[PDB]
Amino acid sequence: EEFGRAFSF
Amino acid sequence: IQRTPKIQVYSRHPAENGKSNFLNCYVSGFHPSDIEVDLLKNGERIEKVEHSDLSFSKDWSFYLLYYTEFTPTEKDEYACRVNHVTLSQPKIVKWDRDM
Amino acid sequence: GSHSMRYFYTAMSRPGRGEPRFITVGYVDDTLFVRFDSDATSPRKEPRAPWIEQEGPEYWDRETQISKTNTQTYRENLRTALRYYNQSEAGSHIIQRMYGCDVGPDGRLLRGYDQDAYDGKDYIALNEDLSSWTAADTAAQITQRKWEAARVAEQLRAYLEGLCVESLRRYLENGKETLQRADPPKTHVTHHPISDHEVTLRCWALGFYPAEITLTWQRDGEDQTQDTELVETRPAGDRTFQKWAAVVVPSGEEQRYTCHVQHEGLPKPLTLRWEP
């Protein structure tokens, strides 16, 4: 299962 | 900047005339990812060739497997034709059942 | 024995040919189990291995949403990278990410990973301590400052020590028939005369899994590293891999050469020789 949070550059 | 592809053409199982097998063309170590690969039978492009999902190695270079079912013979010649931005002309690698 | 789970992202811009393509592939060791392609007719996470198909409907909806959100996030990252590097909007660029965890036989976390690259070069990476970052340049340092300010490392650490190892543990159980089965290499040495003074001995390893393997040629008990042609391990297409190592030896001296094979599927390293 993937990490469900995204963080932009 | 850019890395040219390494190319290997081989069969899934040991070659044996008359026996169905799988012809593979493994392209790896390239960057960027766009790449054109054709499998050839006696110089002509084989249709309905399939390939794996784009993946990459620890050094970030890409790799893909192109393959097609085939029944080898003594006369029929096979090869893999590859083009990439790093190649001025398509590179053709012939299948050698000993490689 | 030891196992790993890794997710690989590739985001590629293509000015003039629509929005950047986003692809994700997930692996457990050398087995692909899930994929996502934003260029698909109906983009969604799709199973690529039998053992993952039993995951519930919520699993697939959550996984698909993560990827759809990522498609948008990475298109933004690509626009940001253009600014960070003072690049125009006319070229094609690529952002890649690989993250995941390694577990030992007991299933406990061995190491966590999270690394990003821009146009094939290292950009930023989570250090092994899972609390600090390593930026490759001043552009990545900009992202580092943002992630440090947002405590991103703390959030990833929580994931890597929990859900990552927990899900991998479940996948190993559900797919134990294959994921926990090592297939040893089938080996043989071929003899190919080059001239009247030298011949080629090729040591073959076929049908093995996982991909990790070691093939070496020795001459009178001495490794011939600098004198051995070793091709890259390649996929057979049936989950297994292939590899060979070759050395050019003087005619009549073939018996002074021995091939050595190491694979986790072998209870003991194997020694082979040309069998005329």
Question: What SS3 state is found at C169?
Answer: helix
**C202 DSSP β-pair partners:** C190, C246
Nearest to C27 by CA among C53, C52, C64: C52
The count of other CB atoms within 10 Å of the CB of residue C188 is 15
The count of other CB atoms within 10 Å of the CB of residue B29 is 16
List the single best residue of C73, C95, C168 to mutate versus A (max A Cβ within 10 A): C73
Nearest to B85 by CA among C94, C236, C39, C149: C94
Q: Using the beta-carbon criterion (under 8 Å), do C232 and B29 form an inter-chain contact? A: yes
Q: Using the beta-carbon criterion (under 8 Å), do A1 and C63 form an inter-chain contact? A: yes
Contact (Cβ atoms closer than 8 angstroms) between residue C30 and residue C21: no
Element containing residue C73 per DSSP (H, E)? helix C57-84
Q: Using the beta-carbon criterion (under 8 Å), do C202 and B98 form an inter-chain contact? A: yes
3-state helix, strand, coil in chain C (%, to 5): 30, 40, 35
Q: Using the beta-carbon criterion (under 8 Å), do C163 and A1 form an inter-chain contact? A: yes
Resolution (A): 1.7
- Check residue C231 and report its DSSP letter: P
Burial of B82 (0-12, 13-18, 19+ CB in 10 A): buried
Secondary structure of chain B as H, E, C letters: CCECCEEEEEECCCCCCCCCEEEEEEEEEEECCCCEEEEEECCEECCCCEECCCEECCCCCEEEEEEEEECCCCCCCEEEEEECCCCCCCEEEECCCCC
CA distances from C174 to C25, C50, C167, C168 (A): 19, 9, 11, 10
Nearest to B92 by CA among B54, B50, B47, B39: B39
Two tokens, residue C162 = 């929990």
DSSP letter string over C17-45?
Answer: SSSPEEEEEEEETTEEEEEEETTSSS---
* Experimental approach taken: X-ray
Question: What SS3 state is found at C255?
Answer: helix
Is residue C136 less than 8 Å (CB to CB) from chain B?
no
Instruction: Using CA atoms of C74, C79, C85, C90 in order, give the dihedral in degrees to the nearest 10.
Output: 120
How far is the C-alpha of C68 from the C-alpha of C38, rounded, in Å? 8
Element containing residue C142 per DSSP (H, E)? helix C138-149
User: Cis omega (within 30 of 0) on the bond before B32?
Assistant: yes
With contacts defined as CB-CB under 8 Å, which chain B residues touch C235? Answer: 24, 26, 52, 65
Q: Using the beta-carbon criterion (under 8 Å), do C92 and B10 form an inter-chain contact? A: no
How far is the C-alpha of C12 from the C-alpha of A8, rounded, in Å? 16
HSE value, Cβ hemisphere, 13 Å, CA-based, for C236: 19
- Check residue A1 and report its DSSP letter: -
B touches A, CB cut-off 8 Å, minimum 3 pairs: no
How far is the C-alpha of B62 from the C-alpha of C169, rounded, in Å? 28
**C98 DSSP β-pair partners:** C8, C115
Contact (Cβ atoms closer than 8 angstroms) between residue C109 and residue C161: yes
Element containing residue C61 per DSSP (H, E)? helix C57-84
The count of other CB atoms within 10 Å of the CB of residue C30 is 16
Is residue C120 less than 8 Å (CB to CB) from chain B?
yes
What value, to the nearest 5°, has the Cα angle with vertex C266 and ends C260 and C271?
Answer: 25
Contact (Cβ atoms closer than 8 angstroms) between residue C11 and residue C22: yes
How far is the C-alpha of C67 from the C-alpha of C11, rounded, in Å? 12
- Check residue C145 and report its DSSP letter: H
Nearest to C231 by CA among C207, C215, C218, C254: C215
CA distances from B58 to C9, C92, C133 (A): 13, 22, 18
- Which residue's structure tokens are 């024995």? C1
Contact (Cβ atoms closer than 8 angstroms) between residue C26 and residue C32: yes
Q: For the packed helices C152-159 and C138-149, what is the interaxial angle rounded to 10 degrees? A: 70
With contacts defined as CB-CB under 8 Å, which chain C residues touch A3? Answer: 66, 99, 156, 159, 163-164
Burial of B66 (0-12, 13-18, 19+ CB in 10 A): buried
Two tokens, residue B42 = 């006696």
The count of other CB atoms within 10 Å of the CB of residue C149 is 8
Chain C: nearest CA to A5, how far in angstroms? 8
Residue type, C217: W
How far is the C-alpha of B36 from the C-alpha of B83, rounded, in Å? 5
> Which residues, 6 or more positions from C64, have their beta carbon under 8 angstroms from its beta carbon?
C36, C43, C44, C45
The count of other CB atoms within 10 Å of the CB of residue B49 is 17
The sign of the torsion formed by the CA atoms of C57, C60, C63, C65 equals negative
**C216 DSSP β-pair partners:** C260
**What domains are there in chain B, each with its CATH number?**
1-99 (2.60.40.10)
Q: Nearest Cβ partner of B33 from C10, C98, C231?
A: C10
Please name the residue of chain A whose CA is at the shortest distance from the CA of residue C156.
Answer: A3
DSSP letter string over C148-166?
Answer: HHTTHHHHHHHHIIIIIHH
Please name the residue of chain B whose CA is at the shortest distance from the CA of residue C95.
Answer: B60
**What domains are there in chain C, each with its CATH number?**
1-181 (3.30.500.10), 182-272 (2.60.40.10)
- Which residue's structure tokens are 């440090």? C148
Two tokens, residue B14 = 């040991």
Chain A: nearest CA to C111, how far in angstroms? 16
Q: Nearest Cβ partner of C8 from B24, B34, B56?
A: B56
User: Cis omega (within 30 of 0) on the bond before B72?
Assistant: no
How far is the C-alpha of C115 from the C-alpha of C126, rounded, in Å? 6
